[PDB]
Design a protein around this motif. Structure first.
Motif, mmCIF file in Angstrom:
data_model
loop_
_atom_site.group_PDB
_atom_site.id
_atom_site.type_symbol
_atom_site.label_atom_id
_atom_site.label_comp_id
_atom_site.label_asym_id
_atom_site.label_seq_id
_atom_site.Cartn_x
_atom_site.Cartn_y
_atom_site.Cartn_z
ATOM 1 N N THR A 138 0.981 -1.073 0.100
ATOM 2 C CA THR A 138 0.075 -0.152 -0.024
ATOM 3 C C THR A 138 0.954 1.141 0.070
ATOM 4 O O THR A 138 2.164 0.972 -0.465
ATOM 5 C CB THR A 138 -0.972 -0.367 1.112
ATOM 6 N N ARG A 152 -9.871 -1.726 -5.887
ATOM 7 C CA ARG A 152 -10.231 -2.326 -4.519
ATOM 8 C C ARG A 152 -9.964 -3.903 -4.625
ATOM 9 O O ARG A 152 -9.908 -4.469 -5.543
ATOM 10 C CB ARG A 152 -11.576 -2.184 -4.365
ATOM 11 N N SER A 154 -10.205 -7.551 -4.099
ATOM 12 C CA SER A 154 -11.031 -8.579 -3.706
ATOM 13 C C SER A 154 -10.673 -10.006 -4.226
ATOM 14 O O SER A 154 -9.938 -10.058 -5.385
ATOM 15 C CB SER A 154 -12.442 -8.286 -4.460
#
Ligand SMILES: [Mg+2]
Lengths: 219, 200
Positions: A138, A152, A154
Motif C-alpha cells: 500500500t 479495490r 477482492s
DNA sequence: GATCACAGATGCTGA
DNA sequence: TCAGCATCTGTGATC
C-alpha cells in the motif's frame, strides 16, 4: 521511495489457511483479515502480491512430493510478486543431510521464477511479515512517483484475473487491461475479434485464437 | 565448474573453505561491495543473524542495502542463524518489518541458512544455477478454462460443454441454467455468475 | 508536416 | 527471475 501511508490494512486469507494461528494474530495487529476461497496461495496482500505460507517441514515435504515447484510456477505465472514464507527452521531435524536439496530448491525458486523467500520463526513472525508487506505495498509515492487509481482488493477480482490468465496469449498485464476496458468478464467474452484486439498487448492473431475458443462448438 | 569471487575481507569466513570442497572455484577479488560475486549481475551479502540485527539498529544495513541495490541487478543477503537472535526477542516486529522493506523497497532477496554449511550450499546453488499445460487444440483449452472456475473438475467441465456446446453460451447462461449442470449446484453457480458479472 | 512499412526494440507470457 | 517471441514503434523515404 513510495511515500504516503495507504488505507485500512486489509488482506484475504484462503480458506485452507483460515485454521492457522496466523489470522487471529493478524487481526490482533489491527489487520482486517477476510477469509475467502482464493484461486491460489494463502494470503492476498495487495493487488499483485500473493503469499504462500509453509512450515519449514511442509516446505521440505512438498519439495520431495513434486508439489512445491508446481505450486511455485503457478504462483509466479499469476502474480507479479510471490512470497513464500517459510515458518520454522529452514532445515527441520527429520531432514538433515538432505540439506543440499533444500537450500538448492530455495536458490532455484528464487532464480528460476523470481519467487521471494522469507524465513519466519513461528506464526507470529509470519503474521508480522504479512502485516508489514500489506503496509509497505500500500503506500503511494512521493518524489516523481505518480499515484494511479487502484482496484479495490477482492477475491472475486482475483478469480476474474485467474480465469482471463488461463487463455493463451493472456497473462498478468493483459488480464488486468482486459478488465479495465470491458469492466466485466462477460462483456469481454462477448466482444468481437475487432474489439478484443483494441486491448494493448493483443493482436489479430491472439484475438482470433480467443474468439475461436469462445465460439467453436464442442463435439 | 562454477566460479565465484570472494571478497578479500570475507576470506576469514568459514564459508569459502566449504565452497572449495564442493567443487566451486573460489577466487579472491577485491570487491567494490558484497561478500561473494556469483556473476556480474548477482552479488551475495553474508551476515550473521545478529550482525543483520546489529546493523538494522545502527542503520548500516539499510545503507549497505542501498549500495548493493544501486550497483547490482540482483542482490542476496544470506542471513546465517535464526532470524530473531535471543538478544532481540521483543524487537521482532522491527526485524521482520526490515525484512519486508528490504524486499519490497530495495528488491533485495533474502535467504536464511542455519550455519556456514547452508550458506555455502546456497551460494554453490546460485553459482551453478546461473550456468493442461494446454497445447493448441480448441476442445482442450475449453476444458482447461472451465476448470479454473471454483469447484469445477474435468467431469463437470465435460458436462458443461455437452449442455451448452460453447463457452460463450455458458458464460451467458442463467444461474438456474448453470446450477442444474451435474457437479454445479446453487452454491457453485452463484460464484460463477458473481465471477462472470461483477464489474471492475 | 504527414503517412507507411517494416525492422528492430519493447514488453509480454509462461515458467 | 528471464527465454523466447508477439506486439508495438520509431525511423526515414516518399508525397
Ligand atoms: Mg500453504
Amino acid at each position: 521511495m513510495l511515500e504516503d501511508p495507504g488505507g485500512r490494512p486489509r488482506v484475504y486469507v484462503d480458506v485452507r489457511e483460515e485454521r492457522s494461528p496466523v489470522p487471529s494474530i493478524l487481526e490482533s495487529l489491527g489487520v482486517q483479515v477476510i477469509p475467502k476461497q482464493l484461486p491460489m496461495g494463502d494470503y492476498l496482500v495487495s493487488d499483485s502480491i500473493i503469499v504462500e505460507r509453509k512450515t519449514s517441514s511442509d516446505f521440505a515435504k512438498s519439495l520431495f512430493d513434486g508439489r512445491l515447484f508446481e505450486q511455485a510456477s503457478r504462483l509466479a505465472e499469476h502474480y507479479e510478486t510471490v512470497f513464500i514464507i517459510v515458518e520454522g527452521p529452514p532445515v527441520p531435524r527429520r531432514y538433515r543431510g538432505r540439506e543440499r536439496s533444500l537450500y538448492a530448491a530455495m536458490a532455484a525458486l528464487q532464480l528460476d521464477y523470481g519467487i521471494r523467500l522469507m524465513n519466519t520463526m513461528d506464526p507470529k513472525g509470519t503474521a508480522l511479515v504479512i502485516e508489514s508487506l500489506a503496509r509497505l505495498s500500500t503506500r503511494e509515492g512521493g518524489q516523481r512517483i505518480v499515484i494511479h487509481k487502484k482496484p479495490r482488493l477482492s477475491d472475486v477480482r482475483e478469480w476474474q484475473l485467474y480465469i482471463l490468465q488461463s487463455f493463451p496469449g493472456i497473462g498478468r498485464r493483459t488480464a488486468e487491461r482486459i478488465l479495465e476496458r470491458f469492466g466485466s468478464l462477460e462483456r469481454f467474452f462477448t466482444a468481437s475479434k475487432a474489439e478484443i484486439s483494441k486491448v494493448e498487448g493483443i493482436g489479430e492473431k491472439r484475438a482470433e485464437e480467443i474468439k475461436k475458443i469462445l465460439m467453436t462448438p464442442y463435439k
